RNA sequence: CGUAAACGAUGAGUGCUAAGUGUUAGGGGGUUUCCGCCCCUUAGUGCUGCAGCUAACGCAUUAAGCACUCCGCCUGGGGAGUACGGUCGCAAGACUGAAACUCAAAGGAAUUGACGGGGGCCCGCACAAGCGGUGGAGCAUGUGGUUUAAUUCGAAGCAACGCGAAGAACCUUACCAGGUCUUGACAUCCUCUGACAAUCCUAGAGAUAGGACGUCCCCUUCGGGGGCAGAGUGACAGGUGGUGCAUGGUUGUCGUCAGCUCGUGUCGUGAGAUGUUGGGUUAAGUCCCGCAACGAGCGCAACCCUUGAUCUUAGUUGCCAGCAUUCAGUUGGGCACUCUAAGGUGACUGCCGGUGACAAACCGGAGGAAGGUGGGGAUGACGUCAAAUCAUCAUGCCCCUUAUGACCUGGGCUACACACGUGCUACAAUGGACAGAACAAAGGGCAGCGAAACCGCGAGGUUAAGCCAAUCCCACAAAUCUGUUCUCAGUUCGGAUCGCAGUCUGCAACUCGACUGCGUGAAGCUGGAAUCGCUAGUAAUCGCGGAUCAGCAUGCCGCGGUGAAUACGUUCC
């Protein structure tokens, strides 16, 4: 069988990042990169406006707050249902960070996902936020189950 | 759910069309006229052991070639055979019919005549081992790189009907350059219906 | 014959096949007929050849060892079957014996 | 007490009958005072092994060998080590020990399989990792029940249930009700006498008739012969009647799994084994190496079809690069380019390096359009489910025959309290509505495709160009992108249901068609237990096309448009 790997596209015409196009491919509903590109650039223009900063550094700070060190996997032996904590390899750190940004942004609820993604980045920058509940809770699940490693 | 017929599998690779023309405006009508032709000619020469009929359509004219493996039963005395054969076809089709009859040397390599030869022996109450083994020796001496004759039905045994393989040599139904003759025949016996499936791997083309 | 079939069907068929068939069918290649006798070097090492020799009732000459059975071999020679000079000596004597025979 | 799987499941004694090898307690020898090595012999205790034995497993000098002596015990399984009697025992029980009755087996050892909540290895959207759903609502569709005059029949876990049905208004259509028919609606017969047709009127729901009118057949040397018609007569027909547990043929499924076998040989009393196992390897019983096997066949792969690229030929109806004109590739012009369709070339672990046995193969590199069966398709081994199909067909047998057959109209297969598969549409801002701009592929068209114009709000309508089609049409692609607008509500969401008015198809849209126009606007605010699909141009989403077909598509079959997320891994199902 063996492990297979995938690829992704380097630039964005404004905000030249790999991972921002990785977020473009994420949150794509029904095969529409155009709508996700529109949502993303209008959101980052809100992040450049509402806070007078470049939104690249705010976006990496939000990622750094969300990227989880420790997943907690499963291990059922007998009738025990133990969860076992896993040191996450950093690709999955970035992609769990992007899932938590996208999911808790669209789960928030405001008058566009432009605004939801903007305010979720602004919350995950100054770490207290909705996806960071999931960050904290995964680290708490790894903290409770640390007896197994 | 099993094997695709090798005749229908190798059409348009190496095995030609039997029915060779091009459609103008009554393709269905030409088809069913030729089905009536093949029914009529195979009924009439199922005494005279005709295997295959290739039909042309040549702008109001039909060239029928007939592969028989004996000439003088079907071209015969010359006059009478071509009279009773071209004349009734000119009637029951409605236009000109020309008949060219190619004779199959090595009568035991064409699977239609071979399957009919096994079917008649079952109808002649010859045992269903003797038919297939005798015919396999006849075909493998007539020269074939493999033969497979499979007979199924009630073999003279009432409440269980089973399939019977006899074969010699390579019969490679998956090689798509094979030139394999496949042919069925049916044998209505007193105990029911027997089905003869013979296919003869004869040699491939590089 | 024709040496041009495919670019490598001569390889995958011919070469691969020549290797195994030459190495194993050796100099018994041109045998054409059943042999009269059989000269082996060790019966314990080669019970299969000794077995079907005694079955086919071919009389056998042979060097045996002290752990081998002299009842099974028709013509028993006691000597060294893994010292190369003793086996060279015995095959030498017997090949000279058969070379002195056809006249 | 007096019993144990109290066993070596192997009575005691004795003698004989190859070896190799540990070990326990002794003895003696050949050099050495020794340590210690070797040799030799006892008695006990292990293992492997020849002859011999055995049904085989195996035993084999510690016999299950070859013998002799003596003892104990067995004579199918159950009932049953039971009951009765006796002896012994405090007792529990022990020992001795049947019979009626009942069965055709019980049993040993071995072989092939299958299975294991046994071990090993491996693989697959199987699990995980994700992404989207189904289960909730509405509707479309199929199925169970139930209502029925009939709700025709067939399928029934995976492998039935948007299945046969690639199109139930009539037909189909079998089923029901009523009117009917009886060599018959369909095909060979026999005998005639000539054409059959065609229309009109009456019936009649129509079939079926009464009729009128009309019959023109022909071919020859005169007898006839190719039709069709009726008219008899009887052979016969006709069954979508039953049996898929009588069948042929054709399929599903395991499963595109990698297996399934045979020849000759040898092994075994035999069943069987061997090959086919073992090591590495593979997508693969693929391939190599070793091997009591050597081969072979069906499978696997390859050839076959498509897509990925380029060369030659071939440029019109296709293409517009430079040559000017054009509302327009329209014209002149050109085969460069795309395209098309033929022949090629091409990718083979071939070359490099590395590993591994040097093999087979594997990991990376260069080249290249293409890299390790490149993506897909077609191909479905021996056999498994007495799987499915007697309703596509052909069928053996059994049944019906003035009817279980045939015609005709009307209904039903669309019923509906309920469950239940598959699907479509939504519940909404990545949204809804309104306006502008663009980009496709593949396929269809002769009583068919139908431009343009005109009219109608619209579904569409009238006249009609072109097209048997790389020309002309279907054909104004849609999500998309760009502006305007609502602002998070059962709403500018959603469209069910329904009233009215229309349109098209067709004898005919009432049960029972699709579509339009106006209006009404429902359940529904992302779905419990449970559960499915997918590893890349895939899933998700968007339209287009075609079969079927007058008309009916949310189904199916293909086509493109945008177009992801994840695979640590085999712990678990």
UniProtKB/Swiss-Prot annotation, chain A:
Keywords: Ribonucleoprotein, Ribosomal protein, RNA-binding, rRNA-binding, tRNA-binding. It holds the Pfam family Ribosomal_S7. InterPro entries: Ribosomal_uS7, Ribosomal_uS7_bac/org-type, Ribosomal_uS7_CS, Ribosomal_uS7_dom, Ribosomal_uS7_dom_sf. GO terms for molecular function: mRNA binding; rRNA binding; structural constituent of ribosome; tRNA binding. GO terms for cellular component: cytosolic small ribosomal subunit; ribosome. It comes from the Bacteria. The keyword Nucleus does not apply. One of its GO terms (biological process) is translation. Part of the 30S ribosomal subunit. Contacts proteins S9 and S11. Interacts with VmlR. Belongs to the universal ribosomal protein uS7 family. NCBIfam families: rpsG_bact (TIGR01029). One of the primary rRNA binding proteins, it binds directly to 16S rRNA where it nucleates assembly of the head domain of the 30S subunit. Is located at the subunit interface close to the decoding center, probably blocks exit of the E-site tRNA. This is Small ribosomal subunit protein uS7. It comes from Bacillus subtilis (strain 168). The lineage of its organism: Bacteria, Bacillati, Bacillota, Bacilli, Bacillales.
From Swiss-Prot, chain B:
Gene3D superfamilies: 3.30.300.20, Ribosomal protein S3, C-terminal domain. Belongs to the universal ribosomal protein uS3 family. GO terms for cellular component: cytosolic small ribosomal subunit. Keywords: Ribonucleoprotein, Ribosomal protein, RNA-binding, rRNA-binding. This is Small ribosomal subunit protein uS3. It comes from Bacillus subtilis (strain 168). GO terms for biological process: translation. Part of the 30S ribosomal subunit. Forms a tight complex with proteins S10 and S14.
Curated annotation (Swiss-Prot), chain C:
It comes from the Bacteria. Part of the 30S ribosomal subunit. Interacts with BrxC. Belongs to the universal ribosomal protein uS2 family. This is Small ribosomal subunit protein uS2. It comes from Bacillus subtilis (strain 168). The gene is rpsB. The chain holds residues 124 to 226 of 246 of the full protein.
């Amino acid at each position: 069988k063996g492990p297979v790997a995938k690829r992704d596209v380097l630039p964005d015409p404004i905000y030249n990042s790999k991972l921002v196009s990785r977020l473009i491919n994420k949150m794509m509903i029904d095969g529409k990169k155009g709508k996700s590109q529109t949502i993303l650039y209008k959101s980052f223009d809100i992040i450049k406006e509402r806070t007078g900063n470049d939104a690249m550094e705010v976006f990496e700070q939000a990622l750094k707050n969300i990227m989880p060190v420790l997943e907690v996997k499963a291990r059922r032996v007998g009738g025990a249902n133990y969860q076992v904590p896993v040191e996450v390899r950093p690709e999955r750190r970035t992609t769990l960070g992007l899932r938590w940004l996208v999911n808790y942004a669209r789960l928030r609820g405001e008058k566009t996902m432009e605004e939801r993604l903007a305010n979720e980045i602004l919350d995950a920058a100054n770490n207290t936020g909705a996806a960071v509940k999931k960050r904290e809770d995964t680290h708490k699940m790894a903290e409770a189950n640390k007896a197994f490693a | 759910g099993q094997k695709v017929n090798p005749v229908g599998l190798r059409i348009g690779v190496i095995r030609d069309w039997e029915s060779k023309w091009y459609a103008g405006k009554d393709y269905a009508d030409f088809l069913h006229e030729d089905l009536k032709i093949r029914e009529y000619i195979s009924k009439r020469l199922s005494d005279a052991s005709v295997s295959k009929v290739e039909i042309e359509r040549a702008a109001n004219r039909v060239n029928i070639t007939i592969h028989t493996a004996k000439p003088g039963m079907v071209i015969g005395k010359g006059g009478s055979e071509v009279e009773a054969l071209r004349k009734a076809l000119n009637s029951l089709t409605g236009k000109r019919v020309h008949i060219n009859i190619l004779e199959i040397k090595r009568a035991d390599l064409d699977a239609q005549l071979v399957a009919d030869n096994i079917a008649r022996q079952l109808e002649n109450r010859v045992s269903f081992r003797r038919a297939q083994k005798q015919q396999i020796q006849r075909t493998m001496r007539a020269g074939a790189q493999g033969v497979k004759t499979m007979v199924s039905g009630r073999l003279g045994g009432a409440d269980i009907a089973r399939s019977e393989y006899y074969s010699e040599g390579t019969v490679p139904l998956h090689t798509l350059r094979a030139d394999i003759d496949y042919a069925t025949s049916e044998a209505d016996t007193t105990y029911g219906k027997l089905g003869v499936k013979v296919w003869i791997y004869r040699g491939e083309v590089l | 014959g024709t040496f041009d079939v495919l670019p490598k069907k001569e390889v995958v068929q011919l070469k691969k096949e020549l290797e195994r068939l030459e190495k194993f069918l050796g100099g018994i290649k041109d045998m054409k007929d059943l042999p009269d006798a059989l000269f082996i070097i060790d019966p314990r090492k080669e019970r299969i050849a000794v077995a079907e020799a005694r079955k086919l009732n071919i009389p056998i000459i042979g060097i045996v060892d002290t752990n081998c059975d002299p009842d099974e071999i028709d013509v028993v020679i006691p000597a060294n079957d893994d010292a190369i000079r003793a086996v060279k000596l015995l095959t030498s004597k017997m090949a000279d014996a058969i070379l002195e025979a056809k006249q």
